[model samples]
Target: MDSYQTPLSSASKEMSKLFSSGARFGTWRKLWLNLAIAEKELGLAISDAAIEQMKANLELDEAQMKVAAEEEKKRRHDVMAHVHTFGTVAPEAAGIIHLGATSCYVTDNADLIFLRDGLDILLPKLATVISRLANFAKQYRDLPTLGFTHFQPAQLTTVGKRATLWIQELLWDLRNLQRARDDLGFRGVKGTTGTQASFLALFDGDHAKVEALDKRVTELFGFPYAYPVTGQTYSRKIDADVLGPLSSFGATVHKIATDIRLLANLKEIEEPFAYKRNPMRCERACSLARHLMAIYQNTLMTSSVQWLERTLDDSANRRVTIPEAFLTADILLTTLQNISEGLVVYPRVIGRRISQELPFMATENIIMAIVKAGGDRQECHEKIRVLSHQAGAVVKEEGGENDLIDRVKNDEYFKPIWGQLDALLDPRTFVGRAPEQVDGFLKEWVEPALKPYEEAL
Candidate 1:
């Protein structure tokens, strides 16, 4: 019962018409559907009569688009085939369809329609993601977590605030993408040439209608302005600039994901504020289905924040990082939620590892405590140097203890508040206000910028 195996005869079985345009069948079909919807929303040249049939034709465009794709495999020219196939399909409307249009005219305008629809789908979903992160930050605004600088522990912060850091970064990108979409508005209405040579003769030198029609279509496409003037195509800069977000967006997603992977390794941080059991833990899982997206975000019917990320920037690197981070975040966010609520903990195991710094980390902590105790800074360093060597001796003693604190505390000369001395060696408090710093950043920047884009749209 697969459509791929046996093409659906569901729609009116007018022999499967093919197109010659360059766009993919699926892409063109979507474009046409959006255009027909655009026509319905605000009529586009005798729209009421054409809109319904245009929509029906757009549905038919699917099969034609497929044929076009197959043809493109051999031809490698998508837009031309799309246009030619579309002309053939509706031979009656052929001459008028692309009148004054360059390939870009149809393609770019179609993209405008698609991008607008994309925003319609994403703005609300992004808002919800923002709200989730905001609520999370506010809820755990003071839950202290260790912060890092250059991947080295620097200070303490509330995990809630850290979560906001991720939220804030996502919001900034969303705003950036939104603004770029706005600024990059509609494509130009210039005809075959930027000069409108075709329309010039039809109007007997009346060029005002060209500008007027451009203005009208700009409004119809839900953009404030059109490019007004351009060559064979709207500047390719638009395409490059729009795609530029992918570079930085990868960094943002990587920040959160890298943190989660590290935290997961360290046992300090986790996903979610809660946990749900899953029977399958497949190794080569592709993407999270909508079912998983809902359960992870804690909603019965969720709008995909992950999809919102993918839509904003789908660069090659971002293509990997965005989805990986999003799905991993689903895993981490749920785990964090569970850890915060009544989750299991083994403090003894944690305690055993708490002061368990590597040689360099312990040395740094020892230097600080020794300096704080009014001992000679250099003398204290010499003592640590001698004792570190001695600990090394003990570790290599075959059956000797591997514990540095034990060896350092055991020497007969080390009698200065020995029991209380171990307290000074704690590195947890050594990190600066990293947790609070990340939280403070989110509060000061990301949350305020979430002014509902709905009214603006």
Candidate 2:
């Protein structure tokens, strides 16, 4: 026991704060609560029933947070001190508490709980988001928007197609996350140090009950497949494995936001608002929140931490990173929701943007048309190059008339029915059933995928 003791007021509140915030620990607390409720309500046999009581007894309100903090100061053994303090609060429950469970139980189950709860929040929202994007794509299916490649304007794509790119990427990310969530089953019934050394004695040399309970307990926590084998640590690889999909989730969402930001720069489609905040007080709540971290990171002390940080202290810069990351997706979802109802595509601008890079984007179309009309690849490329270049120049010099029409009128390279070339590059006809593709993709993927979740709600 601790011969010396320290006071609560002097102890640090950082860990509690971390666990209580949107950070891992905070998320863990939520899962822990859910597990308890599952035990109480679902009658799941979670081994650590006292987790509920420990939290209740330790309470982490003003007084308990102070007491636990003080123990960290005195005993200097954080988890042990927790056991000690909790033993005082609910002696009966605390006795059955943390039995046969190791620290990994706390961390791993806690991790699962976060993924389960967080994804529970995220997956349906993800489905809804994709639905929004899919529907938005459909609304603009027939409307041509400029497609860009290598950061240069290319041929035609519908606005719906651009939205389709986002949804498709999200779909992949969602699949990966599901795989990772499934992979994080409790490190089933592994004895202390990967051998049954500690637990084997209790079974009088029979590990069957131990094995059964181990699997049973994890299953109780909703984990079915625990590791059939190994270790003091429940395969730290699992942490990184879990992290792998999770990090990709952030990347996928961030990529969506980044694309929206880039589009906003081009003034085509924006996330949700023109400015970060709305001039109207009524909608300012939604609009201002759209770019909270952007304003903070860009205008305030911009760290190497970049645009990701959330809290003022910036724990690993996540306070800004995670929420802002999710916020951008949230706003885009909002935009998708509105556009799905009725999307608007500025075809004129889209057409212009496409003309600037039509040489590449519509190369297939150009090649097909020229060959069909009996022109060689060399002959066609030369003629089309002249036309595309003129368009590019005009675009750079600030938009005149239709360069395709003009190039045909002035150039006399066997000008036989020059109007045919004119018709093909209209930007409208260049998309090759693109609107239809968006519709098909949505019908096939988005709507059906989101349906079950919709029913769940």
Query: Which candidate number would show the highest lDDT if scored against the true structure?
Result: 2
Off by over 4 Å in 2: 1-60, 94-96, 188-191, 274-345, 352-426
Error of 2 at 261 (Å): 2.9
TM-score of model number 1? 0.60
lDDT of 2 by residue, 341-431 (tens): 4333446665666655564455556656667777787887787777777676776686665466566557765365465766766777778
User: Residue-pair clashes per candidate, as listed?
Assistant: 39, 10
Worst lDDT run of 10 residues, candidate 2, spans 6-15
In order of appearance, the predictions have TM-scores of 0.60, 0.66
Candidate 2: C-alpha lDDT: 0.54
State in Å the error of residue 174, model 2: 0.9
How high is the CA lDDT of each candidate model? 0.50, 0.54
